[PDB]
Symmetry: none
Subunit: 199 residues, 4 copies
Amino acid sequence: PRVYVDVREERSPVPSILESLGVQVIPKQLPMGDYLVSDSIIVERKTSSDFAKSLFDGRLFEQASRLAEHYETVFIIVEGPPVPRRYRGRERSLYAAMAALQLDYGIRLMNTMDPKGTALVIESLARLSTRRLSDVREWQLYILQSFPGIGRRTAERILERFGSLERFFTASKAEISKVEGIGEKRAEEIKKILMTPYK
Amino acid sequence: PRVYVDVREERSPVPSILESLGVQVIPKQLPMGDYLVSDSIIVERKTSSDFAKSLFDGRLFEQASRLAEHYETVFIIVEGPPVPRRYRGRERSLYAAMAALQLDYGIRLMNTMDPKGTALVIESLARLSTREGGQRIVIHKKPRLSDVREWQLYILQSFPGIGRRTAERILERFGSLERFFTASKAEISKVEGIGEKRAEEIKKILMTPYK
Amino acid sequence: PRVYVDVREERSPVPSILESLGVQVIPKQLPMGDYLVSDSIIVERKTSSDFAKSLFDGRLFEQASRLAEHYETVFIIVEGPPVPRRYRGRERSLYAAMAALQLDYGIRLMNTMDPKGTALVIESLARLSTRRLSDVREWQLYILQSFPGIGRRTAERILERFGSLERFFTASKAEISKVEGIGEKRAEEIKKILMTPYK
Amino acid sequence: PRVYVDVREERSPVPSILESLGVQVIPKQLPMGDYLVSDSIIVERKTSSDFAKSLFDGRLFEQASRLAEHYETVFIIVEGPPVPRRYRGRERSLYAAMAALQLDYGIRLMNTMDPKGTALVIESLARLSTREGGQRIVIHKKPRLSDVREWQLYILQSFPGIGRRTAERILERFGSLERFFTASKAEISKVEGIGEKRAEEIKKILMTPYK
């Protein structure tokens, strides 16, 4: 397991703990990030302090996007407490940032408790590497709104009383017409469209 | 912004601090996780003690893959310090697992400090996923078409895959829209145009219940 | 000019006034309507009384749809005053019906003042026969919402400040970012997507 | 429910009785008709006296066809009795015209009794055209795509006609999305996939102003 270290990183305790772990550490530089586990996996290392200062600095997302732009797998390692003593306050700000990075950048947070913690995670990434049905609601509301007289509300309102598309398609003018937003008028047109044979 | 919580969870502080934060919490019987943020985002809450216990049984990776083969986003929010004093000297396994969880299964891992942190994350995920601009909204004006048969065709073409031609062919084959809407995955895909794939998708649409 | 008359019609004064006009009248059926001008054009004749009584009877739309179902061109002739003396009251009801028939059934109302009036219109139909850029707004709102961070409101909000799709596409990060709903963040991503060269 | 009224019309009772009836009347300079009910429905109001005058000049069919080649629904609301005493003995021409108007040009003709009738019709047309169920509404969930180039493609494919292949080909040809968005109807349709038709549609999208 090789990992590359950017030079401005060479000096933490982490390369030492990494080597001590059987992981070869190579000084490179690196156009981005802190350790390059691979070719797809880059790791930014941050003390929760540095995370914090850098959030309220644009610096966190500046880095973030850029990191996401070039590597398939961006890991931000947060070393020490998710929320340092000094920043408990703008706490919803930090957790928030953590969610957005995770979803919008697909960046991956790990919190380690110290340098060993961080070396540990990087050594692991190292070894590990070198080793919407909910789309259905819409098509239903889509299809239902395809019927004359039916909009989106009436459509959800149909899946309300009926739940299946099938049971509504199997329904009586008798049961259909009552659904608010479908008259008898409309209802008759529907049961009819639904039942007239092809030319 | 609403999230569904599991019952087991109506035990916790979290749900309530969720309501504190402008989030409508609705208890549900969830086939998985503790918190469901959207169609696509599930959250499994675990204090760190339990995270570790759950690892050391085997029960951990089993529940992770389950989640991960059902939701396209899976967060495991780990509550408390990643390594409990209770588990000093087992970091290598604690960490390697956290690692294997993201790398092999994708599973995301927010680690938060208390149940407040926990709420605050879910809160953010609630809010984030419900922002306009994560969604494309179209309004089609509808034909004032005249013939039944034309509506009949129009209608059919709104099913996924079906164009106008298969439309005709469906009705050539089944006669009623009624009888097609009733037809089996065999009888349905036997129609040139609708392949076996498109048959499954259609019945799914046809017979899946609502919310 | 032949027109067909349904038998239950033969007896109005209209076939007489029609013949007197050079228009041949032939007793038939008729499965529908009152006069068949053609093969595509059918005419339902109604005294505004009969129109009125038949509106608050379902009878008007029962007839209506059925009429629309079978002929390409349905004319309802309303003879005498659009709103009889007796019905001034449910007046919004009559005009309403008149709009709905006209749009939903594409049925065509003509009001004549009497039988001559009606014969006159039918004789005319007789001779006459035998002789959405607004779709653009959407594609714009469609396309705009195709950009990361942009929903429908932000999109209309873009055509608000910008009006052209082109001028916004030509815009400065400087002008872009301010549009409410687009940060600098998002803005930078946009000007960037808009300006990065192809692989 | 809002309709735009022409200025000439801010003369009439109608607009006001429109506001009486729950309709937001907005005065505009309209390139045609007196009342604009939707994208697609224009209304030309004419008392019957003027209907006839306007016939007997020649000015009638000229304005009808204009309307009819710009709106897919055209109503001429005729206010007052179809034949003014003023025009007895010219029914044949009055009627034949009403006839020729619907049959040759499509133009629909509500005849109403006073300016109240007139309002009441517009009111109904206002309401009718704004009813849910005249519209199909879709909500697409948006890719959390990763690469610029992919957004770049996604984006392109949202233009009418353009699939993924032409997408590539556009960017092969123009380099920037920026420069393509700037390109002329010639330079645009010179792209295999976008024909001369699809070029017009695109610029139209690209350069038509708003509302």
